[PDB]
Amino acid sequence: GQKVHPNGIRLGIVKPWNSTWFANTKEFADNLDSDFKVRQYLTKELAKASVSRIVIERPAKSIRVTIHTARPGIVIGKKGEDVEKLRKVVADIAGVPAQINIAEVRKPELDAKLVADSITSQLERRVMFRRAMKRAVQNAMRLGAKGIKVEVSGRLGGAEIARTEWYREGRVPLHTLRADIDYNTSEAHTTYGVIGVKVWIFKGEIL
Amino acid sequence: ELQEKLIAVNRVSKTVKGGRIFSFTALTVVGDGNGRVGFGYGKAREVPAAIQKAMEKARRNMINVALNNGTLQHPVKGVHTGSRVFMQPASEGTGIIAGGAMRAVLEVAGVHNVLAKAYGSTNPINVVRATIDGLENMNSPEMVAAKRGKSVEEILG
Amino acid sequence: MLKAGVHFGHQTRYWNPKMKPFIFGARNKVHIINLEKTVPMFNEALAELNKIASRKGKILFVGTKRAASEAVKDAALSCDQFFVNHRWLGGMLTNWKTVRQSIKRLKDLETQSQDGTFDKLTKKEALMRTRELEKLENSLGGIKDMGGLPDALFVIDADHEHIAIKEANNLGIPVFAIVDTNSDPDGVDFVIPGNDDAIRAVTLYLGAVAATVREGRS
RNA sequence: GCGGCCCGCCGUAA
RNA sequence: GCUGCAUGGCUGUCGUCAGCUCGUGUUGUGAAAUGUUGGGUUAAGUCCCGCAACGAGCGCAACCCUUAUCCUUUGUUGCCA
RNA sequence: AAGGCGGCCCCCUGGACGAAGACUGACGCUCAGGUGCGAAAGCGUGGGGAGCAAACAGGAUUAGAUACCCUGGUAGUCCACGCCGUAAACGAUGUCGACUUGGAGGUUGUGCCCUUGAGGCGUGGCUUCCGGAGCUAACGCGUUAAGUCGACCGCCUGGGG
RNA sequence: GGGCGUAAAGCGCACGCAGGCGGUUUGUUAAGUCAGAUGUGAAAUCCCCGGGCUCAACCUGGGAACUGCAUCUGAUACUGG
């Protein structure tokens, strides 16, 4: 255990929060619990789509939720019926009335969460891990990025000690605070336990 | 158009302060099936990288030999560090009867009938030199006639 | 020819035995170069260089020795040709692919240079950029505006520049070196015996080559 | 220029 | 409930020590080497010069927080020449 | 020839080398079995005995110390005459003959040129150190080969036992 | 169709009998060597060209092979006298 969490260390410099609201000591825990419940429900329900990031903001007597995704048509449906079912359930979870929004992901090969869970999904169908890693890295480099690093850990088929591999090219400086690094993880349950996946993407240094 | 062959792959180690780090090597041969052949040798941390790295090195390194209807008229022998090789022409109908890497070299080169044999040590890397061992030190009758200042017909008789 | 403006070998104890065919009798403790068999070889080399220049072959000049530096830099840049003046980098030819990046960096730096301090007044960065450009220019000043892989090389000292000759032999490019008594003909060369440290001698060598090349274009 | 200071059970990463 | 010697995740330690590698090119039959070695410096593979090497990457340094000096803005529940 | 040989003087005695000239006319090379010479230690008989010193005796050091260190000390080391026949007796490289690019020395002869001077040209023998082609598994050897060849002899055949 | 500097392997060094090996011409001999011819080298077996059992194992016709030995004639470059 040696590396500081890349996202957390930059929360006040070049990175925003995901939940933004003000409260006092009385309702802090309740607000946190409600946000946890709604995020968990949304993640469970919208697994089939490509969900990347949930941002929760509390207006005065209200809750506002925005979802970032790469295939918005599936989430929003033929008409607004499915978003309305989601809004009903969310407003049930948290007492205040709720409103929903949809964001658009332009380049799904960035936004490390999508790359990570894509690799996990591939691993779930018994495909060689090395091909998946090389494919993802080549795609990300082709689409334009100054660097990328991926790694996988766990029982990769062999009963011997769980192994670890990683590839990297470009530039991924982790000790400079100005750098804009996107980082996320995932894990896949197989017949031989779980496998961990981590992704670093260096979009570009920010002045 | 070129034919490529893979001969041998093996794992190779090296010791440092923290433990051991491994690597792989590949040995490949490339020929045109007509009298031009070359080989290459590459190293990398992964098998595919070494495989692909040997190929273009072989491509840049080629020589030409002078055969005749699928062989030439020399019982020839060549040597390297610890290997001896013997090759002689075969009449017809026969194949490329030969033990190891000589098989691949003679197959890609363009020979169809030969009676090779290997002595001494037999590790693939030094016996592959069978190219330089004797294949390019072979004399056609016309070049012999040119050297001796005579004509081919009465050189043969 | 007749002026005998070229001196001869170093000493009888620093000599390559392979130079026996070109050697003359030695009298004052030093070897004497036979001039009777240097004129025809020189003329043949001149004719070949003329026919190559008529083919716009992008001839190359080398010879960093602190004495022929300005001489080769003036003989070059005269007609159309390029030169190497300092510190032949090992692998300019076999590893030209990597040297192209250094050339490109030099080009970008010189384009920025004409308005350099205007971009930013942080004098540390401007000064270090100027120093970097100065360091970079001398090693590739003569070769910056070249397509790559010339078709001929002219070498003043043979043994002193063996790396360039090895690279040329590996690539397969004819060479036109000048061989003294303490060197040896190894590469595919148009061997030209003669002294290689006398200023008059080297000037005489380069003048004929420059005239021949400048005529060859027309 | 010179004072002394011994040992480490059996097998065992791919 | 058993197996941290089937695992993910999360920590300790050498150690805030200055090191650890790659692409292309050369040398060797090969394991490998070169670069990273040499002179002078620095807290530092920090920098100049030299040199079959020429360039990159993770490290070092800088970008972050606080403390020490001044200047504008605002002046309560804080201050009084 | 190898083992080996160092103060100075005399007597007996072996080999090598150089210059010039004469003479004999293949009279040569290698060599199983055979014969001779072989450091140091050791053995026999008779002498000699300063220094050093196995064995041995004390004093220390040490967990112990039949050792390294200190004080003594016999055989032996020396001479004459006989035995022994082994050494990392090593260049770890059998003896003869021929051929193949170069540098820097040492030692001992001799010819010529002004022999002026510690001069310049050569031509023999024996020896050290680098290094080219070539050879070698590599280290390395390299005209005094471990290079290219010829004649004869001696040895080797997995490790222990 | 292998080796002996360091992997196993040059006697500690010499002299030397028996053996093995001989610089250059000329002249004779025909022992070695070479070329012919004849006589021998059983049959069966192997091989080649054939034939017959419905084909094949099997049987059979003819030819090459039997690398040798002896004798006679001839050649004279090389080795021997």
Curated annotation (Swiss-Prot), chain A:
CDD domains listed in its UniProt record: KH-II_30S_S3
Family annotation (Pfam families): KH_2, Ribosomal_S3_C
Gene Ontology CC: cytoplasm; cytosol; cytosolic small ribosomal subunit
Family annotation (PROSITE patterns): KH_TYPE_2, RIBOSOMAL_S3
Annotated KH type-2 domain residues: 38-106
UniProt-recorded Gene Ontology molecular function terms: mRNA binding; rRNA binding; structural constituent of ribosome
UniProt KW keywords: Ribonucleoprotein, Ribosomal protein, RNA-binding, rRNA-binding
SUPFAM superfamilies per record: Prokaryotic type KH domain (KH-domain type II), Ribosomal protein S3 C-terminal domain
Listed GO biological process terms: cytoplasmic translation; ribosomal small subunit assembly
PANTHER family: 30S/40S RIBOSOMAL PROTEIN S3, SMALL RIBOSOMAL SUBUNIT PROTEIN US3C
Oligomeric and partner information: Part of the 30S ribosomal subunit. Forms a tight complex with proteins uS10 and uS14. With proteins uS4 and uS5 encircles the mRNA as it enters the ribosome, which may play a role in mRNA helicase processivity. Some nascent polypeptide chains are able to cross-link to this protein in situ. In collided ribosomes contacts ribosome rescue factor SmrB.
Purpose of the protein: Binds the lower part of the 30S subunit head. Binds mRNA in the 70S ribosome, positioning it for translation. Plays a role in mRNA unwinding by the ribosome, possibly by forming part of a processivity clamp.
Protein name in the entry: Small ribosomal subunit protein uS3
Swiss-Prot record, chain B:
Keyword Flavoprotein: no
UniProt cross-references to Gene3D superfamilies, sorted A to Z: 3.30.160.20, 3.30.230.10
GO cellular component, one term: cytoplasm
Any GO molecular function: rRNA binding
Domain (S5 DRBM): residue spans on this chain: 2-65
Domain of life where this protein originates: Bacteria
InterPro entries: Ribosomal_Su5_D2-typ_SF, Ribosomal_uS5, Ribosomal_uS5_bac-type, Ribosomal_uS5_C, Ribosomal_uS5_N, Ribosomal_uS5_N_CS, Ribsml_uS5_D2-typ_fold_subgr
Keywords: Acetylation, Antibiotic resistance, Ribonucleoprotein, Ribosomal protein, RNA-binding, rRNA-binding
Biological process according to GO: cytoplasmic translation; maintenance of translational fidelity; response to antibiotic; ribosomal small subunit assembly; translation
Subunit structure: Part of the 30S ribosomal subunit. Contacts proteins uS4 and uS8. With proteins uS4 and uS5 encircles the mRNA as it enters the ribosome, which may play a role in mRNA helicase processivity. Can be cross-linked to mRNA. In collided ribosomes contacts ribosome rescue factor SmrB.
Family, per entry: Belongs to the universal ribosomal protein uS5 family.
Entry note about domains: The N-terminal domain interacts with the head of the 30S subunit; the C-terminal domain interacts with the body and contacts protein uS4. The interaction surface between uS4 and uS5 is involved in control of translational fidelity.
Function: With uS4 and uS12 plays an important role in translational accuracy. Many suppressors of streptomycin-dependent mutants of protein uS12 are found in this protein, some but not all of which decrease translational accuracy (ram, ribosomal ambiguity mutations).
HAMAP family according to UniProt: Ribosomal_uS5_B
Additional note from the record: Altered uS5 proteins have been identified in a number of mutants. Some mutations in uS5 have been shown to increase translational error frequencies. Some mutants in this protein can partially suppress an alanyl-tRNA synthetase mutant.
Protein's UniProt name: Small ribosomal subunit protein uS5
Species annotation: Escherichia coli (strain K12)
UniProtKB/Swiss-Prot annotation, chain C:
Superkingdom of origin organism: Bacteria
Gene3D superfamilies: Glucose-6-phosphate isomerase like protein, domain 1, Helix hairpin bin
InterPro entries: Ribosomal_uS2, Ribosomal_uS2_bac/mit/plastid, Ribosomal_uS2_CS, Ribosomal_uS2_flav_dom_sf
One Pfam family from the record: Ribosomal_S2
Modified residues (N6-succinyllysine): K107
Record keyword Lipoprotein present: no
Gene Ontology molecular function terms on file: structural constituent of ribosome; zinc ion binding
A GO cellular component entry from the record: cytosolic small ribosomal subunit
BP terms from Gene Ontology: cytoplasmic translation; ribosomal small subunit assembly
Keyword Ribonucleoprotein: yes
PROSITE patterns: RIBOSOMAL_S2_1, RIBOSOMAL_S2_2
Protein family per UniProt: Belongs to the universal ribosomal protein uS2 family.
Record text on subunit structure and interactions: Part of the 30S ribosomal subunit, contacts bS1. Some nascent polypeptide chains are able to cross-link to this protein in situ. In collided ribosomes contacts ribosome rescue factor SmrB.
UniProt function note: Required for ribosomal protein bS1 (rpsA) to bind to the 30S subunit.
Protein name stated in the entry: Small ribosomal subunit protein uS2
Source organism per UniProt: Escherichia coli (strain K12)
